[PDB]
Amino acid sequence: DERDRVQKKTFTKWVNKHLIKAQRHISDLYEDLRDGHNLISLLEVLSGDSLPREKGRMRFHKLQNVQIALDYLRHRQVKLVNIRNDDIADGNPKLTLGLIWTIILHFQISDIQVSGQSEDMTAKEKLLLWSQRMVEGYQGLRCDNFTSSWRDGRLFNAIIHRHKPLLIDMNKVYRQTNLENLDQAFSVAERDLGVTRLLDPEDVDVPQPDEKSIITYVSSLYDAM
Amino acid sequence: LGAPQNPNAKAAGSRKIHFNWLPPSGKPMGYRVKYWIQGDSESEAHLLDSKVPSVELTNLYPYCDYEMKVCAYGAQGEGPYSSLVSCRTHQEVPSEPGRLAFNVVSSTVTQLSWAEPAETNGEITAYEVCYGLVNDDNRPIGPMKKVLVDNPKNRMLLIENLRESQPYRYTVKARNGAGWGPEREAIINLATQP
């Protein structure tokens, strides 16, 4: 619940980022999507294609509006399980979160490519392999999961420094707090790599950080490299 | 062709309202009433042919703003339309809540998730979740355990400390100013569940 809110936050900031071209912005994920007009804009941008829109205000209209968004995903071979038009237009949060994850998984974690691939691995494993491969030569650093591995934020500062050593002093991140590592990494990634601050340090420095929110941010960290 | 001044309109039920106005002077054989939802077109309104200075409108959406206006036609024809009135219908019992979707954590812990009622009929103020033991024939074993949701904002509920491999009945109801509503019920056994 409070456990869930972090993921709700991360998805919201993600959707908003890709929205702004379509100059709308979400304040609450569970309500501002129900009409589908925002959903369709997200797909209209993330692909360039031009999707249709009903303009009525009856339930039937928003139901028919959102079905257009789901069908563009269905037509794109994307596998939607246990998600109905009846689900989203009223804003069943878990199924709304579920859809937005699917979109992130399809559009931002599909073309993951790393040296030495076994062409069976899921997208996650590839990014998990990509993560490990970058932090390969650093000392005392392993990235075994998208949960408890990134708590310190040391992994973040490595992935940066591997790309561009002109911006990170690795010896310092070894000594300072988990927060200082998180914040400095995040600011560096925004001001110099053009990635958006999808995560706030306070949310991460906890025992079991939201895996889905992590995967989303490392995905945003891969586009820039 | 005089205009009918001094009209007043109010609600009469949860799905009907009553429009009255003081008669003009001239040649009205019968009346016509324009009426639409506040936020809708002027020309795209519903019209209702009346002969008497009073009507009872029907198939109106509860908790919805309405605008209306009445003219008078007869030996010369339609005259001026009266002063525009604005009336909002009463609240009503909300429908069944959305699909009951679970998120299975452990054999004793779950995550209950539902959607806001299909047609709200007013502003939903609170919900109610009730869960408990059951057999195979949907006949409960013991009392339900009703937990009042605090605010209508949250549709998420956590449920822990439960018997494993035992079927449970869950119910969700919706409350809006008019009162409670019909329930949505799901039988779910966390063992069979993924």
Pairing of strands B184-188, B17-20: unpaired
Question: Same domain, yes or no, for B168 and B138?
Answer: yes
Could you list the residue range(s) of the whole structural domain that residue B165 is in?
A: 91-194
Return the bridge partners of B168, or none: B133, B188
For this PDB entry, the determination method is: X-ray
Question: Same domain, yes or no, for B120 and B54?
Answer: no
**Cα(A31)–Cα(B114) distance, integer angstroms:** 14
**Cα(A191)–Cα(A184) distance, integer angstroms:** 11
Phi-psi label, residue A70: left if phi above 0, alpha if psi -120 to 50, beta otherwise = alpha
Nearest to A90 among B115, B154, B156 (CB): B115
Question: Same domain, yes or no, for B132 and B84?
Answer: no
Closest CA relative to residue B172, chosen from B112, B139, B125, B129 = B129
**Cα(B46)–Cα(B37) distance, integer angstroms:** 9
Q: In what order do the strands lie in the sheet with B124-133?
A: B145-148, B124-133, B168-176, B184-188
- Strands of chain B (E only): list them: 8-11, 17-20, 28-37, 46-50, 54-56, 65-74, 85-88, 101-102, 110-113, 124-133, 145-148, 156-159, 168-176, 184-188
The token pair at A6 is: 């972090």
**Cα(B106)–Cα(B160) distance, integer angstroms:** 9
Domain boundary among B62, B90, B118: B90
**Cα(A197)–Cα(A188) distance, integer angstroms:** 10
Domains of chain A by start residue, with CATH: 5-103 (1.10.418.10), 115-213 (1.10.418.10)
Contacts of A78 (CB under 8 A, 6+ apart): A102, A106
Question: Same domain, yes or no, for B171 and B77?
Answer: no
Contacts of A55 (CB under 8 A, 6+ apart): A61
**Total number of domains constituting chain B:** 2
Question: Same domain, yes or no, for B15 and B106?
Answer: no
Question: Same domain, yes or no, for B52 and B117?
Answer: no
Question: Same domain, yes or no, for B40 and B109?
Answer: no
Domain boundary among B90, B125, B156: B90
Residue B83: count of CB within 10 angstroms of its CB: 13
Question: Same domain, yes or no, for B56 and B78?
Answer: yes
The token pair at A199 is: 């995560």
Question: Could you tell me if B98 lies within 8 Å of chain A, comparing CB atoms?
Answer: yes
**Cα(A162)–Cα(A127) distance, integer angstroms:** 16
* Burial call A151-181: b when 16+ CB within 10 Å, e when fewer: bbbbbbbbbbbbbeeebbebeebeeeebeeb
H or E segment and range at residue A217: helix A211-222
- Give this entry's resolution in angstroms: 4.0
Mutual orientation of helices A37-45 and A59-75 as an angle, nearest 10°?
Answer: 20
**Cα(A18)–Cα(B105) distance, integer angstroms:** 32
Question: Same domain, yes or no, for B190 and B133?
Answer: yes
Question: Same domain, yes or no, for B117 and B75?
Answer: no
**Cα(A159)–Cα(B24) distance, integer angstroms:** 82
Return the bridge partners of B126, or none: B175
Closest CA relative to residue A144, chosen from A164, A120, A124 = A124
Question: Same domain, yes or no, for B57 and B112?
Answer: no
HEC readout, A16-73: HHHHCCCCCCCCCCCCCCCCCHHHHHHHHHCCCCCCCCCCCCCHHHHHHHHHHHHHHH
**Cα(A44)–Cα(A69) distance, integer angstroms:** 9
Tell me the chain B residues in contact with residue A59 when contact means C-beta distances shorter than 8 Å.
118-119
Question: Could you tell me if B23 lies within 8 Å of chain A, comparing CB atoms?
Answer: no
Question: Could you tell me if B101 lies within 8 Å of chain A, comparing CB atoms?
Answer: yes
Domain boundary among B54, B70, B90: B90
Rg (Cα) of chain A, in Å, rounded? 19
- How close, in Å, is residue B152 to chain A by CA atoms? 12
Nearest to A94 among B101, B116, B118 (CB): B101
Nearest to B99 among A1, A59, A92 (CB): A92
CATH of the domain at B194: 2.60.40.10
Question: Same domain, yes or no, for B175 and B96?
Answer: yes
* Burial call A55-93: b when 16+ CB within 10 Å, e when fewer: eeeeeebbbbbbbbbbebbeeeeeeeeebbbebbbbbbb
SS3 B148: strand
